[PDB]
Amino acid sequence: PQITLWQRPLVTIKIGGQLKEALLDTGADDTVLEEMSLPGRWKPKMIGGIGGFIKVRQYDQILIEICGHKAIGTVLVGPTPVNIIGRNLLTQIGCTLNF
Amino acid sequence: PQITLWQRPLVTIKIGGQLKEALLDTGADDTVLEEMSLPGRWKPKMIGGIGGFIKVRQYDQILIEICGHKAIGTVLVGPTPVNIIGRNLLTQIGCTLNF
Ligand SMILES: CC(C)[C@H](NC(=O)N(C)Cc1ccccn1)C(=O)N[C@@H](Cc1ccccc1)[C@H](O)[C@@H](O)[C@H](Cc1ccccc1)NC(=O)[C@@H](NC(=O)N(C)Cc1ccccn1)C(C)C
Numbered sequence: 566p567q568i569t570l571w572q573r574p575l576v577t578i579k580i581g582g583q584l585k586e587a588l589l590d591t592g593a594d595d596t597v598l599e600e601m602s603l604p605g606r607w608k609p610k611m612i613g614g615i616g617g618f619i620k621v622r623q624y625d626q627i628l629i630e631i632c633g634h635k636a637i638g639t640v641l642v643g644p645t646p647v648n649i650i651g652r653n654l655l656t657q658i659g660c661t662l663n664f
Numbered sequence: 665p666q667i668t669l670w671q672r673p674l675v676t677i678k679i680g681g682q683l684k685e686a687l688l689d690t691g692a693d694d695t696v697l698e699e700m701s702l703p704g705r706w707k708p709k710m711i712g713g714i715g716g717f718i719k720v721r722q723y724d725q726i727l728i729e730i731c732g733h734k735a736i737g738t739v740l741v742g743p744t745p746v747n748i749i750g751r752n753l754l755t756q757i758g759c760t761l762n763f
Binding site for chain 2: 566568569571573574588590592594597615618619632634645649656658659661662663664
């Protein structure tokens with residue numbers, strides 16, 4: 566698909582059989598998801614952004630599906646206001662910017 | 665061009681006669697640049713993201729050029745970690761996400 570940017574590029578993801586929505590975000594190096602309790606081992610981590618840093622839990626090797634496309638990678642889980650799909654998973658689905 | 669996302673989608677912009685690099689950012693509603701003097705009057709504004717809120721100055725109707733394509737629109741200046749080009753100007757230059 567081609568997604569225009571008139572509105573926020575929110576799409577449906579599947580994670581663990583749940584559907585959710587998430588923002589496709591080319592300016593994020595990492596993927597950050599709203600608080601949830603996945604199984605698995607985590608590491609603590611701090612990620613930063615516009616106003617500062619928050620604390621998150623890092624899970625590795627998580628499979629997410631983005632508009633029917635699979636990707637497998639690290640996900641950070643924390644008190645984010647929005648689910649963010651970053652470049653580590655966008656590359657896997659062949660996603661480009663074009664103009 | 666077509667930009668892949670294996671690395672950060674930094675490009676060169678020209679603004680107020682300077683060259684800067686900025687991040688092409690589909691997850692941002694707005695464009696935020698590092699502190700600089702632009703000509704023009706401005707309004708104080710607040711914007712947020714991960715981490716919280718920062719206070720910026722809003723300049724309207726600013727000409728900026730992004731990889732040789734012109735855009736005229738609102739630019740916020742303030743203590744951002746990185747120069748961000750958001751969706752208000754990506755749409756002007758015809759930017760889409762594709763996969
Ligand atoms: C999620 C983090 C892990 C991420 N950080 C990150 O990737 N790094 C710190 C590494 C790095 C360093 C240098 C260059 C690139 N990357 C981040 O916040 N990235 C930003 C851009 C940025 C990078 C580095 C420093 C500072 C900023 C995202 O790409 C950017 O799109 C965010 C995404 C976002 C949206 C909502 C809430 C939290 C985060 N938007 C923003 O921060 C903008 N805000 C908004 O657009 N809104 C709040 C509106 C909104 C509301 C709801 C939904 C979407 N958007 C700012 C720039 C105005």
